[PDB]
């Protein structure tokens, strides 16, 4: 069974970039939408539009890559090198505001879900809250 949504998502994303696709589909859902909402505004991706595949609702997340390298294997640096769920189901991990992590000397980002909504470590702290720390991405 599909045991963790977000998780799948992240993996479709992760799994797509690696092969270098332009965009990748993925089951829609307000929440998942708010995460993609972040990515693009954070710049890890171009953007995403709502869609219907044979009648079902899907989110087209549009991939973003780096320039063509020189020399051998000109496989472009990927905008999203790292991306993993931190709090998994059956080992959920909530953090306190003090405890919010700094990612990659603050190069990456972290996304939680606070009672004031789904956020970025930076935003959270600016916001004075903490919550389910969904994922690392850099």
């Amino acid at each position: 069974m599909l045991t963790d949504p977000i998780a799948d998502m992240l993996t479709r994303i992760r799994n797509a970039t690696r092969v270098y696709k332009e965009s990748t589909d993925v089951p829609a859902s307000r929440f998942k939408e708010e995460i993609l909402r972040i990515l693009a505004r954070e710049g890890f991706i171009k953007g995403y539009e709502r869609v219907d595949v044979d009648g079902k609702p899907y989110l087209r997340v549009y991939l973003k890559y780096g320039p063509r390298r020189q020399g051998p294997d000109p496989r472009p640096e990927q905008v999203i090198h790292h991306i993993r769920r931190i709090s998994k189901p059956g080992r959920r991990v909530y953090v306190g505001v003090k405890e919010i992590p700094r990612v990659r000397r603050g190069l990456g980002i972290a996304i939680l879900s606070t009672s004031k909504g789904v956020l970025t470590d930076r935003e959270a702290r600016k916001l004075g809250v903490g919550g389910e720390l969904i994922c690392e991405v850099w």
Binding site: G43, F44, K64, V79, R104, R105, L107
Partner: protein, 150 residues
């Protein structure tokens, strides 16, 4: 200019009828105390010779290194099949903190204070190799912005 530093040398055996014809292995690190560091694996029948060989190799596989006030702009762990390497930036006054190999490589990178740690197989060769792809990955705050633009 460039400072040759000797990682390590090993003598290997190739077999044959009635003898154990040997072969020498050299590992060198080369750099500027600025930020270019080469690294070669020079193999040869005579050591001074292998060394001389490794020399050549290294001067080619150099790696420009970003250098915020003497340290590394951001942590990184890099798996090298076997060995893994932790690279973690620290404050001035802490001084390099690794072993023989990564030191040698960082030392010449002009890295000054930094926090290492070796894990998994501790094969000089690999470890080294790892500390390379290690450094090769590092990216500046700048370098990243440039990466997500437009």
């Amino acid at each position: 200019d460039f400072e040759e530093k000797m990682i390590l040398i090993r003598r290997t055996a190739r077999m044959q009828a009635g003898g154990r014809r040997f072969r020498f292995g050299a590992l060198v690190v080369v750099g500027d105390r600025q930020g270019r560091v080469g690294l070669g694996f020079g193999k040869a029948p005579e050591v001074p010779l292998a060394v001389q060989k490794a020399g050549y190799y290294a001067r080619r596989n150099m790696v420009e290194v970003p250098l915020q006030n003497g340290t590394i702009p951001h942590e990184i762990e890099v798996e090298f099949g076997a060995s893994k390497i932790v690279l973690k930036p620290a404050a001035p006054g802490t001084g390099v903190i690794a072993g023989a190999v990564p030191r040698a490589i960082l030392e010449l990178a002009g890295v000054t204070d930094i926090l290492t740690k070796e894990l998994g197989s501790r094969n000089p060769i690999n470890i080294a190799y790892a500390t390379m792809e290690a450094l090769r990955q590092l990216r500046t705050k700048a370098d990243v912005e440039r990466l997500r633009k437009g």
